[PDB]
Ligand binder design. Sequence first.
Ligand SMILES: C[N+](C)(C)[C@@H](Cc1cnc[nH]1)C(=O)O
Ligand SMILES: [Cl-]
Ligand SMILES: [Cl-]
Ligand SMILES: [Cl-]
Ligand code: NA
Length: 425
Amino acid sequence: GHMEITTDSLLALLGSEKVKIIDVRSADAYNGWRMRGEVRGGHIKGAKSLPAKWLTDPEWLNIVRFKQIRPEDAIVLYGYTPEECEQTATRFKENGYNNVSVFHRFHPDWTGNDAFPMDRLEQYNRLVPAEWVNGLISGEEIPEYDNDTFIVCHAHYRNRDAYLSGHIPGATDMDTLALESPETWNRRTPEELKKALEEHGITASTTVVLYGKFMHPDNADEFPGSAAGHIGAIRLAFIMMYAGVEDVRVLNGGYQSWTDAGFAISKDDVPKTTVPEFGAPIPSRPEFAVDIDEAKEMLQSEDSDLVCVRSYPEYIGEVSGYNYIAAAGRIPGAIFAECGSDAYHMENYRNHDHTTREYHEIEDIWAKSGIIPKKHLAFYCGTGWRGSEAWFNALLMGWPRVSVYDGGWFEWSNDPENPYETGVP
Ligand SMILES: C[N+](C)(C)[C@@H](Cc1cnc[nH]1)C(=O)O
Ligand SMILES: [Cl-]
Ligand SMILES: [Cl-]
Ligand SMILES: [Cl-]
Ligand code: NA
């Protein structure tokens, strides 16, 4: 019943402003993961991501409208299989979208023929799906993995209960306080990171798969970070990558993506299998970390900028954003990139299933504010968690000079002589 567009008609529609090509597959296949063993992973050039699993969520229509997909547009759906687009095509028709067509020949006609344009996340192999993690712990052959030593880490902030309430089988928990000091809220000393990483069984040659569990943080609680598990996992990914771990993966979406895939969980308290040595100088990637002295230089140079990954009430100085940060204000000269509702949510960088937002939508918003890969960018926030997530998103894009200003507003405001702004800009 649904209309069909031929491959030649779709090739002619490429570049039109009225046409919207929508990838129905998962975000990981959209990012570049070859989920069905295709010769070439990714999406049709110019396509948007709207996974079919979002149909069971009542915000589907709001997600579509938020992506500015209007009924005036010619909708072209595709996936690994045209029958996988039948449910989405019907839902579009039931909501006032009359021009809905299904592209039947994406796999293997578009994937196998390199003459057809395809785009992908340049560093997608660091944003692993749940199926990849399951194959890793099962000893099965998986793509984008050529190592022999791995470890799955469940990140949390003074909350082992986040690990004991349910985790990936065989995984071990790492409190974020093991890699960052509560005094400076920055990354720890190399000697401290060396001891901490070794005691958790992590070497530089180890493939560390990091993930966290979202447990709905509340700003009024004592330690809301204990529920922002996935932000801490990306925060720990930044520190480990800065330390010298070469193969660091992050589970796209966190713990929920594991359970949403139908994989069982474990509640065991897995003991740590320590390693005698880390095996590399810490830090082996010093470029990833930027401190306050270098941050002030980047504010003065047109070659560099700092990206304020904070919430709007924090940016205008209405609130500090934390129950342990006294001063309220913003660093002058930094480019504002709103993170989300408060300091413990990343709505502007995530989907409703906590997977990373469509990376094309992120770089377009960043481009409108001057945040471009041409510059050396040091993302920051209150202490570094939200800045690390935005930094990881840019690193997945392949940006050559992205860093994290570790000190953030906390270190900046701890000095009374540092300038600061307030109110609406
Ligand atoms: C540095 N701690 C762990 C105390 C932060 C972490 C954090 C979460 N969202 C932004 N930052 C906090 O919990 O407020
Ligand atoms: Cl297009
Ligand atoms: Cl989270
Ligand atoms: Cl700021
Ligand atoms: Na920090």
